[PDB]
Amino acid sequence: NVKWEDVAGLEGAKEALKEAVILPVKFPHLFKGNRKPTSGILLYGPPGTGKSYLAKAVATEANSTFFSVSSSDLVSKWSEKLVKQLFAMARENKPSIIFIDQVDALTGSEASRRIKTELLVQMNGVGQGVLVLGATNIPWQLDSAIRRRFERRIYIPLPDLAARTTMFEINVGDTPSVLTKEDYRTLGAMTEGYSGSDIAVVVKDALMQPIRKIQSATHFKDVSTRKLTPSSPGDDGAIEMSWTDIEADELKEPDLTIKDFLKAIKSTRPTVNEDDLLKQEQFTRDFG
């Protein structure tokens, strides 16, 4: 789970969410009298950008309750009362943010119309401690009515160089790493186009690499600091043995090298193509 102080500048979006969510949600006293805040916020942009974790981080920072639901889950399963339930929960726990993922899914038939109704109903009934945060990867297929209920709209872009580096560091985490921060910048530089999600897929592949090299192995060498590391037929001091019979305390718990990530980066290719980003920038012109 992402932390707010970790969240990147987002080509403006971090500061926008500060002005739009945190300020009014955390400091309502500040909007006393003949001034008032907006209502309804649509986060939009390329997929894989982790908007709901971004939503979560802004909630945690605004010191508000957080309820997230998925439209595609709501529409492609069983449910009008569940929408009713969620807003009731939110009212009991003011201030609270309701995040609704994939607001696309409420436009497509049948049950989709029935949920769009109730959501729209609930929001009209909302608008003074219940902020609604919708998210969509496909704002072009977003219905005017739904759209019109999201006054503020914020574009969440793909990660840039600094962001991607950080993502590589965070995803790795506590894991035994012998990687330079210079080597991390390589990984960031290396992954232009990748979404934070794309990147997670990569790291999970990379972290399984030391391990996979242990089970692939058939020979081991005592790199005595016994501590056995994988090898091949006859390098320097190899023993033709089974990893399944190495003692837990006799296993050279291997370190992460850059090349672990390289194979994985060369595998997984970017989700979001150049075509899709163009259709996003049109939305920002006419609706942003």
PDB file of C-alpha atoms in Angstrom:
ATOM      1  CA  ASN A   1       0.000   0.000   0.000  1.00  0.00           C
ATOM      2  CA  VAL A   2       1.440   3.360  -1.184  1.00  0.00           C
ATOM      3  CA  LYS A   3       2.047   6.160   1.363  1.00  0.00           C
ATOM      4  CA  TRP A   4       1.242   9.830   0.619  1.00  0.00           C
ATOM      5  CA  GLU A   5       4.720  11.185   1.322  1.00  0.00           C
ATOM      6  CA  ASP A   6       5.840   8.567  -1.249  1.00  0.00           C
ATOM      7  CA  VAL A   7       3.280   9.690  -3.887  1.00  0.00           C
ATOM      8  CA  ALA A   8       4.879  11.533  -6.828  1.00  0.00           C
ATOM      9  CA  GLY A   9       4.124  15.101  -8.033  1.00  0.00           C
ATOM     10  CA  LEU A  10       2.146  13.517 -10.891  1.00  0.00           C
ATOM     11  CA  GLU A  11       2.580  16.403 -13.386  1.00  0.00           C
ATOM     12  CA  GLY A  12       0.367  18.476 -11.063  1.00  0.00           C
ATOM     13  CA  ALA A  13      -2.099  15.864  -9.757  1.00  0.00           C
ATOM     14  CA  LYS A  14      -0.663  15.549  -6.215  1.00  0.00           C
ATOM     15  CA  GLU A  15      -1.099  19.304  -5.648  1.00  0.00           C
ATOM     16  CA  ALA A  16      -4.551  19.168  -7.257  1.00  0.00           C
ATOM     17  CA  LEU A  17      -5.679  16.442  -4.822  1.00  0.00           C
ATOM     18  CA  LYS A  18      -4.278  18.521  -1.969  1.00  0.00           C
ATOM     19  CA  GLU A  19      -6.345  21.550  -3.072  1.00  0.00           C
ATOM     20  CA  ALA A  20      -9.406  19.473  -3.931  1.00  0.00           C
ATOM     21  CA  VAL A  21      -9.653  16.680  -1.352  1.00  0.00           C
ATOM     22  CA  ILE A  22      -7.331  17.227   1.605  1.00  0.00           C
ATOM     23  CA  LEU A  23      -7.965  20.910   2.179  1.00  0.00           C
ATOM     24  CA  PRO A  24     -11.791  20.722   2.315  1.00  0.00           C
ATOM     25  CA  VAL A  25     -11.959  17.187   3.847  1.00  0.00           C
ATOM     26  CA  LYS A  26      -9.380  17.822   6.582  1.00  0.00           C
ATOM     27  CA  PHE A  27     -10.095  21.493   7.209  1.00  0.00           C
ATOM     28  CA  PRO A  28     -13.862  22.122   6.837  1.00  0.00           C
ATOM     29  CA  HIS A  29     -13.699  25.089   9.333  1.00  0.00           C
ATOM     30  CA  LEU A  30     -11.716  26.827   6.576  1.00  0.00           C
ATOM     31  CA  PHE A  31     -14.761  26.743   4.303  1.00  0.00           C
ATOM     32  CA  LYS A  32     -17.104  28.360   6.818  1.00  0.00           C
ATOM     33  CA  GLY A  33     -19.571  31.016   5.614  1.00  0.00           C
ATOM     34  CA  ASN A  34     -20.332  32.424   2.143  1.00  0.00           C
ATOM     35  CA  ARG A  35     -17.557  30.313   0.539  1.00  0.00           C
ATOM     36  CA  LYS A  36     -17.969  26.606  -0.299  1.00  0.00           C
ATOM     37  CA  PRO A  37     -15.964  23.722  -1.850  1.00  0.00           C
ATOM     38  CA  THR A  38     -16.744  21.757  -5.052  1.00  0.00           C
ATOM     39  CA  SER A  39     -18.088  18.147  -5.081  1.00  0.00           C
ATOM     40  CA  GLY A  40     -17.359  14.906  -6.964  1.00  0.00           C
ATOM     41  CA  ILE A  41     -13.875  14.122  -8.283  1.00  0.00           C
ATOM     42  CA  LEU A  42     -12.967  12.014 -11.298  1.00  0.00           C
ATOM     43  CA  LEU A  43      -9.468  10.560 -11.455  1.00  0.00           C
ATOM     44  CA  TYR A  44      -8.686   9.574 -15.050  1.00  0.00           C
ATOM     45  CA  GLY A  45      -5.721   8.371 -17.087  1.00  0.00           C
ATOM     46  CA  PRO A  46      -3.892   5.332 -18.537  1.00  0.00           C
ATOM     47  CA  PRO A  47      -4.507   1.948 -16.795  1.00  0.00           C
ATOM     48  CA  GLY A  48      -2.012   0.468 -14.370  1.00  0.00           C
ATOM     49  CA  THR A  49      -1.464   3.792 -12.706  1.00  0.00           C
ATOM     50  CA  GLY A  50      -2.893   2.585  -9.349  1.00  0.00           C
ATOM     51  CA  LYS A  51      -5.546   5.261  -8.857  1.00  0.00           C
ATOM     52  CA  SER A  52      -7.308   3.478  -6.017  1.00  0.00           C
ATOM     53  CA  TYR A  53      -4.105   3.349  -3.989  1.00  0.00           C
ATOM     54  CA  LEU A  54      -3.693   6.983  -4.821  1.00  0.00           C
ATOM     55  CA  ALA A  55      -7.287   7.485  -3.630  1.00  0.00           C
ATOM     56  CA  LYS A  56      -6.452   5.554  -0.432  1.00  0.00           C
ATOM     57  CA  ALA A  57      -3.365   7.650   0.253  1.00  0.00           C
ATOM     58  CA  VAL A  58      -5.309  10.901  -0.067  1.00  0.00           C
ATOM     59  CA  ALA A  59      -7.950   9.592   2.329  1.00  0.00           C
ATOM     60  CA  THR A  60      -5.361   8.571   4.923  1.00  0.00           C
ATOM     61  CA  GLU A  61      -3.830  12.015   4.621  1.00  0.00           C
ATOM     62  CA  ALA A  62      -7.135  13.830   4.861  1.00  0.00           C
ATOM     63  CA  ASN A  63      -7.744  11.766   8.051  1.00  0.00           C
ATOM     64  CA  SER A  64     -10.996  10.396   6.606  1.00  0.00           C
ATOM     65  CA  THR A  65     -12.688   7.026   6.321  1.00  0.00           C
ATOM     66  CA  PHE A  66     -12.152   5.184   3.036  1.00  0.00           C
ATOM     67  CA  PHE A  67     -14.662   2.996   1.194  1.00  0.00           C
ATOM     68  CA  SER A  68     -13.753   1.641  -2.208  1.00  0.00           C
ATOM     69  CA  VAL A  69     -15.982  -0.331  -4.562  1.00  0.00           C
ATOM     70  CA  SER A  70     -15.678  -1.521  -8.182  1.00  0.00           C
ATOM     71  CA  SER A  71     -18.284  -0.707 -10.812  1.00  0.00           C
ATOM     72  CA  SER A  72     -17.315  -3.727 -12.917  1.00  0.00           C
ATOM     73  CA  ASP A  73     -17.653  -5.835  -9.745  1.00  0.00           C
ATOM     74  CA  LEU A  74     -20.962  -4.159  -8.934  1.00  0.00           C
ATOM     75  CA  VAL A  75     -22.274  -4.630 -12.505  1.00  0.00           C
ATOM     76  CA  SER A  76     -20.750  -8.041 -13.382  1.00  0.00           C
ATOM     77  CA  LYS A  77     -22.009  -9.814 -10.206  1.00  0.00           C
ATOM     78  CA  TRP A  78     -25.428 -10.281  -8.527  1.00  0.00           C
ATOM     79  CA  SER A  79     -27.045  -5.121  -5.877  1.00  0.00           C
ATOM     80  CA  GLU A  80     -28.679  -1.650  -5.878  1.00  0.00           C
ATOM     81  CA  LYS A  81     -28.896  -1.940  -2.077  1.00  0.00           C
ATOM     82  CA  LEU A  82     -25.117  -2.421  -1.823  1.00  0.00           C
ATOM     83  CA  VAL A  83     -24.695   1.030  -3.356  1.00  0.00           C
ATOM     84  CA  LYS A  84     -27.274   2.228  -0.858  1.00  0.00           C
ATOM     85  CA  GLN A  85     -25.347   0.477   1.931  1.00  0.00           C
ATOM     86  CA  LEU A  86     -22.023   2.133   1.092  1.00  0.00           C
ATOM     87  CA  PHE A  87     -23.275   5.737   1.311  1.00  0.00           C
ATOM     88  CA  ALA A  88     -24.983   4.917   4.613  1.00  0.00           C
ATOM     89  CA  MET A  89     -21.661   3.629   5.966  1.00  0.00           C
ATOM     90  CA  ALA A  90     -20.004   6.851   4.779  1.00  0.00           C
ATOM     91  CA  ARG A  91     -22.504   9.068   6.586  1.00  0.00           C
ATOM     92  CA  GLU A  92     -22.007   7.259   9.893  1.00  0.00           C
ATOM     93  CA  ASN A  93     -18.262   7.886   9.536  1.00  0.00           C
ATOM     94  CA  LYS A  94     -17.896  11.528   8.391  1.00  0.00           C
ATOM     95  CA  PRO A  95     -15.551  12.714   6.967  1.00  0.00           C
ATOM     96  CA  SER A  96     -15.277   9.803   4.567  1.00  0.00           C
ATOM     97  CA  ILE A  97     -14.256   9.280   0.961  1.00  0.00           C
ATOM     98  CA  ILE A  98     -16.100   6.907  -1.329  1.00  0.00           C
ATOM     99  CA  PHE A  99     -13.935   5.596  -4.128  1.00  0.00           C
ATOM    100  CA  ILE A 100     -15.738   4.018  -7.063  1.00  0.00           C
ATOM    101  CA  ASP A 101     -13.431   2.199  -9.461  1.00  0.00           C
ATOM    102  CA  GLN A 102     -14.205   1.740 -13.186  1.00  0.00           C
ATOM    103  CA  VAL A 103     -17.076   4.257 -13.406  1.00  0.00           C
ATOM    104  CA  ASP A 104     -16.950   3.197 -17.092  1.00  0.00           C
ATOM    105  CA  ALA A 105     -18.843   0.012 -16.293  1.00  0.00           C
ATOM    106  CA  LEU A 106     -22.079   1.864 -15.500  1.00  0.00           C
ATOM    107  CA  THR A 107     -22.598   2.704 -19.186  1.00  0.00           C
ATOM    108  CA  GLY A 108     -21.662  -0.690 -20.637  1.00  0.00           C
ATOM    109  CA  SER A 109     -27.056  -2.541 -20.179  1.00  0.00           C
ATOM    110  CA  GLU A 110     -29.750  -3.905 -17.808  1.00  0.00           C
ATOM    111  CA  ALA A 111     -28.203  -3.958 -14.302  1.00  0.00           C
ATOM    112  CA  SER A 112     -25.776  -1.214 -15.383  1.00  0.00           C
ATOM    113  CA  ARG A 113     -28.756   1.151 -15.760  1.00  0.00           C
ATOM    114  CA  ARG A 114     -30.083   0.088 -12.352  1.00  0.00           C
ATOM    115  CA  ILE A 115     -26.779   0.905 -10.618  1.00  0.00           C
ATOM    116  CA  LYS A 116     -26.170   4.157 -12.504  1.00  0.00           C
ATOM    117  CA  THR A 117     -29.569   5.274 -11.218  1.00  0.00           C
ATOM    118  CA  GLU A 118     -28.851   4.561  -7.562  1.00  0.00           C
ATOM    119  CA  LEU A 119     -25.318   5.975  -7.667  1.00  0.00           C
ATOM    120  CA  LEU A 120     -26.637   9.168  -9.252  1.00  0.00           C
ATOM    121  CA  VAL A 121     -29.443   9.235  -6.677  1.00  0.00           C
ATOM    122  CA  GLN A 122     -26.984   8.801  -3.758  1.00  0.00           C
ATOM    123  CA  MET A 123     -24.649  11.523  -4.996  1.00  0.00           C
ATOM    124  CA  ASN A 124     -27.445  14.049  -5.358  1.00  0.00           C
ATOM    125  CA  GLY A 125     -28.259  13.095  -1.751  1.00  0.00           C
ATOM    126  CA  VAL A 126     -24.581  13.642  -0.906  1.00  0.00           C
ATOM    127  CA  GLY A 127     -22.712  16.840  -1.868  1.00  0.00           C
ATOM    128  CA  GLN A 128     -21.374  17.698   3.748  1.00  0.00           C
ATOM    129  CA  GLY A 129     -18.658  15.222   4.805  1.00  0.00           C
ATOM    130  CA  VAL A 130     -18.961  12.580   2.027  1.00  0.00           C
ATOM    131  CA  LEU A 131     -16.527  13.101  -0.847  1.00  0.00           C
ATOM    132  CA  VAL A 132     -17.073  10.821  -3.863  1.00  0.00           C
ATOM    133  CA  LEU A 133     -13.962   9.814  -5.848  1.00  0.00           C
ATOM    134  CA  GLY A 134     -14.627   8.020  -9.126  1.00  0.00           C
ATOM    135  CA  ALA A 135     -11.989   6.458 -11.351  1.00  0.00           C
ATOM    136  CA  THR A 136     -11.892   5.611 -15.041  1.00  0.00           C
ATOM    137  CA  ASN A 137      -9.316   4.422 -17.597  1.00  0.00           C
ATOM    138  CA  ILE A 138     -11.788   5.119 -20.417  1.00  0.00           C
ATOM    139  CA  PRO A 139     -13.298   8.634 -19.904  1.00  0.00           C
ATOM    140  CA  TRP A 140     -14.577   8.664 -23.518  1.00  0.00           C
ATOM    141  CA  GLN A 141     -17.099   5.927 -22.732  1.00  0.00           C
ATOM    142  CA  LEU A 142     -18.242   7.841 -19.651  1.00  0.00           C
ATOM    143  CA  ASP A 143     -21.899   8.957 -19.804  1.00  0.00           C
ATOM    144  CA  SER A 144     -22.655  12.697 -19.747  1.00  0.00           C
ATOM    145  CA  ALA A 145     -24.856  12.336 -16.634  1.00  0.00           C
ATOM    146  CA  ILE A 146     -22.201  10.435 -14.652  1.00  0.00           C
ATOM    147  CA  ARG A 147     -19.603  12.838 -16.061  1.00  0.00           C
ATOM    148  CA  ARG A 148     -21.598  15.924 -15.032  1.00  0.00           C
ATOM    149  CA  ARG A 149     -21.624  14.654 -11.434  1.00  0.00           C
ATOM    150  CA  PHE A 150     -17.828  14.795 -11.305  1.00  0.00           C
ATOM    151  CA  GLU A 151     -17.175  18.532 -11.138  1.00  0.00           C
ATOM    152  CA  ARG A 152     -13.418  18.279 -10.560  1.00  0.00           C
ATOM    153  CA  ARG A 153     -11.404  16.086 -12.924  1.00  0.00           C
ATOM    154  CA  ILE A 154      -7.749  15.136 -12.448  1.00  0.00           C
ATOM    155  CA  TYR A 155      -5.468  13.427 -14.926  1.00  0.00           C
ATOM    156  CA  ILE A 156      -3.150  10.747 -13.507  1.00  0.00           C
ATOM    157  CA  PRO A 157      -0.225  10.207 -15.935  1.00  0.00           C
ATOM    158  CA  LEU A 158       2.296   7.412 -16.345  1.00  0.00           C
ATOM    159  CA  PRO A 159       5.299   7.542 -14.006  1.00  0.00           C
ATOM    160  CA  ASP A 160       8.294   9.643 -15.007  1.00  0.00           C
ATOM    161  CA  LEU A 161      11.957   8.943 -14.267  1.00  0.00           C
ATOM    162  CA  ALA A 162      12.022   9.756 -10.539  1.00  0.00           C
ATOM    163  CA  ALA A 163       8.660   8.054  -9.924  1.00  0.00           C
ATOM    164  CA  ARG A 164       9.656   4.823 -11.678  1.00  0.00           C
ATOM    165  CA  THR A 165      12.952   4.575  -9.779  1.00  0.00           C
ATOM    166  CA  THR A 166      11.090   4.920  -6.507  1.00  0.00           C
ATOM    167  CA  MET A 167       8.571   2.298  -7.606  1.00  0.00           C
ATOM    168  CA  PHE A 168      11.418  -0.093  -8.290  1.00  0.00           C
ATOM    169  CA  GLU A 169      12.829   0.591  -4.789  1.00  0.00           C
ATOM    170  CA  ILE A 170       9.457   0.225  -3.014  1.00  0.00           C
ATOM    171  CA  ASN A 171       8.358  -2.966  -4.818  1.00  0.00           C
ATOM    172  CA  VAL A 172      11.697  -4.550  -3.868  1.00  0.00           C
ATOM    173  CA  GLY A 173      11.405  -3.389  -0.246  1.00  0.00           C
ATOM    174  CA  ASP A 174      12.994  -5.368   2.612  1.00  0.00           C
ATOM    175  CA  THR A 175      14.083  -8.111   0.143  1.00  0.00           C
ATOM    176  CA  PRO A 176      17.856  -8.909   0.275  1.00  0.00           C
ATOM    177  CA  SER A 177      19.260  -6.451  -2.277  1.00  0.00           C
ATOM    178  CA  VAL A 178      22.853  -5.683  -3.291  1.00  0.00           C
ATOM    179  CA  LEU A 179      21.698  -2.955  -5.701  1.00  0.00           C
ATOM    180  CA  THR A 180      23.068   0.586  -5.996  1.00  0.00           C
ATOM    181  CA  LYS A 181      20.671   3.552  -6.145  1.00  0.00           C
ATOM    182  CA  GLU A 182      22.555   4.179  -9.388  1.00  0.00           C
ATOM    183  CA  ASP A 183      21.478   0.692 -10.521  1.00  0.00           C
ATOM    184  CA  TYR A 184      17.904   1.605  -9.560  1.00  0.00           C
ATOM    185  CA  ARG A 185      18.034   4.708 -11.738  1.00  0.00           C
ATOM    186  CA  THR A 186      19.082   2.376 -14.549  1.00  0.00           C
ATOM    187  CA  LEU A 187      15.888   0.362 -14.031  1.00  0.00           C
ATOM    188  CA  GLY A 188      13.835   3.559 -14.004  1.00  0.00           C
ATOM    189  CA  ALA A 189      15.560   4.867 -17.136  1.00  0.00           C
ATOM    190  CA  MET A 190      15.093   1.442 -18.647  1.00  0.00           C
ATOM    191  CA  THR A 191      11.307   1.372 -18.289  1.00  0.00           C
ATOM    192  CA  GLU A 192       9.960   4.423 -20.102  1.00  0.00           C
ATOM    193  CA  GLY A 193       6.281   3.852 -20.876  1.00  0.00           C
ATOM    194  CA  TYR A 194       5.771   1.384 -18.033  1.00  0.00           C
ATOM    195  CA  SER A 195       2.935   1.942 -15.554  1.00  0.00           C
ATOM    196  CA  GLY A 196       3.382   1.395 -11.803  1.00  0.00           C
ATOM    197  CA  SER A 197       1.498  -1.803 -12.396  1.00  0.00           C
ATOM    198  CA  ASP A 198       3.665  -2.902 -15.345  1.00  0.00           C
ATOM    199  CA  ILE A 199       6.561  -2.375 -12.940  1.00  0.00           C
ATOM    200  CA  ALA A 200       5.113  -4.548 -10.162  1.00  0.00           C
ATOM    201  CA  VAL A 201       4.783  -7.433 -12.656  1.00  0.00           C
ATOM    202  CA  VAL A 202       8.501  -7.024 -13.434  1.00  0.00           C
ATOM    203  CA  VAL A 203       9.709  -6.940  -9.840  1.00  0.00           C
ATOM    204  CA  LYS A 204       7.686 -10.021  -8.838  1.00  0.00           C
ATOM    205  CA  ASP A 205       9.322 -11.830 -11.765  1.00  0.00           C
ATOM    206  CA  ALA A 206      12.761 -10.530 -10.751  1.00  0.00           C
ATOM    207  CA  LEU A 207      12.495 -11.546  -7.082  1.00  0.00           C
ATOM    208  CA  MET A 208      11.761 -15.168  -8.054  1.00  0.00           C
ATOM    209  CA  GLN A 209      15.046 -15.275  -9.954  1.00  0.00           C
ATOM    210  CA  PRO A 210      17.552 -16.038  -7.157  1.00  0.00           C
ATOM    211  CA  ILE A 211      15.156 -18.802  -6.048  1.00  0.00           C
ATOM    212  CA  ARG A 212      14.673 -20.235  -9.562  1.00  0.00           C
ATOM    213  CA  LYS A 213      18.484 -20.358  -9.873  1.00  0.00           C
ATOM    214  CA  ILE A 214      18.546 -22.486  -6.707  1.00  0.00           C
ATOM    215  CA  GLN A 215      16.088 -25.071  -8.066  1.00  0.00           C
ATOM    216  CA  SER A 216      17.565 -25.020 -11.574  1.00  0.00           C
ATOM    217  CA  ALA A 217      20.907 -25.884  -9.934  1.00  0.00           C
ATOM    218  CA  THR A 218      22.594 -29.306  -9.855  1.00  0.00           C
ATOM    219  CA  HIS A 219      25.989 -28.263  -8.457  1.00  0.00           C
ATOM    220  CA  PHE A 220      26.963 -26.093  -5.502  1.00  0.00           C
ATOM    221  CA  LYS A 221      30.072 -24.319  -4.213  1.00  0.00           C
ATOM    222  CA  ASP A 222      30.934 -23.638  -0.577  1.00  0.00           C
ATOM    223  CA  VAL A 223      31.505 -19.879  -0.618  1.00  0.00           C
ATOM    224  CA  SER A 224      32.463 -20.146   3.089  1.00  0.00           C
ATOM    225  CA  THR A 225      32.072 -16.587   4.478  1.00  0.00           C
ATOM    226  CA  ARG A 226      29.621 -23.927   4.890  1.00  0.00           C
ATOM    227  CA  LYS A 227      27.362 -21.691   2.795  1.00  0.00           C
ATOM    228  CA  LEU A 228      26.464 -23.235  -0.585  1.00  0.00           C
ATOM    229  CA  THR A 229      25.660 -21.261  -3.758  1.00  0.00           C
ATOM    230  CA  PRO A 230      24.482 -22.651  -7.141  1.00  0.00           C
ATOM    231  CA  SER A 231      27.023 -23.474  -9.857  1.00  0.00           C
ATOM    232  CA  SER A 232      27.743 -25.723 -12.865  1.00  0.00           C
ATOM    233  CA  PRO A 233      29.553 -29.020 -13.939  1.00  0.00           C
ATOM    234  CA  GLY A 234      33.065 -28.063 -12.709  1.00  0.00           C
ATOM    235  CA  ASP A 235      34.041 -24.399 -12.100  1.00  0.00           C
ATOM    236  CA  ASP A 236      36.242 -24.102  -8.947  1.00  0.00           C
ATOM    237  CA  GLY A 237      34.766 -26.177  -6.086  1.00  0.00           C
ATOM    238  CA  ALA A 238      31.492 -27.690  -7.324  1.00  0.00           C
ATOM    239  CA  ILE A 239      29.634 -30.652  -5.783  1.00  0.00           C
ATOM    240  CA  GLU A 240      27.079 -32.587  -7.887  1.00  0.00           C
ATOM    241  CA  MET A 241      24.201 -32.558  -5.305  1.00  0.00           C
ATOM    242  CA  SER A 242      20.457 -31.827  -4.624  1.00  0.00           C
ATOM    243  CA  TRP A 243      19.295 -28.434  -3.274  1.00  0.00           C
ATOM    244  CA  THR A 244      16.585 -30.312  -1.419  1.00  0.00           C
ATOM    245  CA  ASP A 245      19.310 -31.748   0.854  1.00  0.00           C
ATOM    246  CA  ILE A 246      21.139 -28.512   1.727  1.00  0.00           C
ATOM    247  CA  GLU A 247      20.706 -27.395   5.364  1.00  0.00           C
ATOM    248  CA  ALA A 248      18.767 -24.150   5.803  1.00  0.00           C
ATOM    249  CA  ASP A 249      21.823 -22.579   7.510  1.00  0.00           C
ATOM    250  CA  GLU A 250      24.150 -23.921   4.782  1.00  0.00           C
ATOM    251  CA  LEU A 251      22.397 -22.135   1.908  1.00  0.00           C
ATOM    252  CA  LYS A 252      23.951 -18.977   0.437  1.00  0.00           C
ATOM    253  CA  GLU A 253      20.823 -16.767   0.577  1.00  0.00           C
ATOM    254  CA  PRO A 254      21.593 -14.984  -2.706  1.00  0.00           C
ATOM    255  CA  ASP A 255      21.543 -11.228  -3.413  1.00  0.00           C
ATOM    256  CA  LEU A 256      19.554  -9.308  -6.042  1.00  0.00           C
ATOM    257  CA  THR A 257      21.616  -8.307  -9.105  1.00  0.00           C
ATOM    258  CA  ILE A 258      20.508  -5.895 -11.861  1.00  0.00           C
ATOM    259  CA  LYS A 259      20.450  -8.773 -14.405  1.00  0.00           C
ATOM    260  CA  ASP A 260      17.527 -10.338 -12.489  1.00  0.00           C
ATOM    261  CA  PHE A 261      15.448  -7.350 -13.595  1.00  0.00           C
ATOM    262  CA  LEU A 262      16.819  -7.222 -17.146  1.00  0.00           C
ATOM    263  CA  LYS A 263      15.350 -10.584 -18.280  1.00  0.00           C
ATOM    264  CA  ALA A 264      12.056  -9.559 -16.625  1.00  0.00           C
ATOM    265  CA  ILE A 265      12.003  -6.112 -18.288  1.00  0.00           C
ATOM    266  CA  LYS A 266      12.815  -7.726 -21.638  1.00  0.00           C
ATOM    267  CA  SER A 267       9.857 -10.049 -21.048  1.00  0.00           C
ATOM    268  CA  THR A 268       6.849  -7.908 -19.893  1.00  0.00           C
ATOM    269  CA  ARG A 269       6.229  -5.092 -22.434  1.00  0.00           C
ATOM    270  CA  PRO A 270       4.248  -1.846 -21.664  1.00  0.00           C
ATOM    271  CA  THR A 271       0.480  -2.173 -21.230  1.00  0.00           C
ATOM    272  CA  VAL A 272      -0.385   1.340 -22.494  1.00  0.00           C
ATOM    273  CA  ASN A 273       0.367   2.032 -26.186  1.00  0.00           C
ATOM    274  CA  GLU A 274       0.990   5.421 -27.868  1.00  0.00           C
ATOM    275  CA  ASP A 275      -2.485   5.303 -29.456  1.00  0.00           C
ATOM    276  CA  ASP A 276      -4.358   5.126 -26.150  1.00  0.00           C
ATOM    277  CA  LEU A 277      -2.560   8.148 -24.619  1.00  0.00           C
ATOM    278  CA  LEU A 278      -3.783  10.344 -27.494  1.00  0.00           C
ATOM    279  CA  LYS A 279      -7.429   9.606 -26.715  1.00  0.00           C
ATOM    280  CA  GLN A 280      -6.740  10.598 -23.090  1.00  0.00           C
ATOM    281  CA  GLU A 281      -5.371  14.042 -24.053  1.00  0.00           C
ATOM    282  CA  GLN A 282      -8.505  14.819 -26.099  1.00  0.00           C
ATOM    283  CA  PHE A 283     -10.619  14.335 -22.974  1.00  0.00           C
ATOM    284  CA  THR A 284      -8.417  16.851 -21.133  1.00  0.00           C
ATOM    285  CA  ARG A 285      -9.043  19.465 -23.849  1.00  0.00           C
ATOM    286  CA  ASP A 286     -12.863  19.364 -23.978  1.00  0.00           C
ATOM    287  CA  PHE A 287     -13.603  18.156 -20.422  1.00  0.00           C
ATOM    288  CA  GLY A 288     -10.458  18.516 -18.258  1.00  0.00           C
TER     289      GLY A 288
END
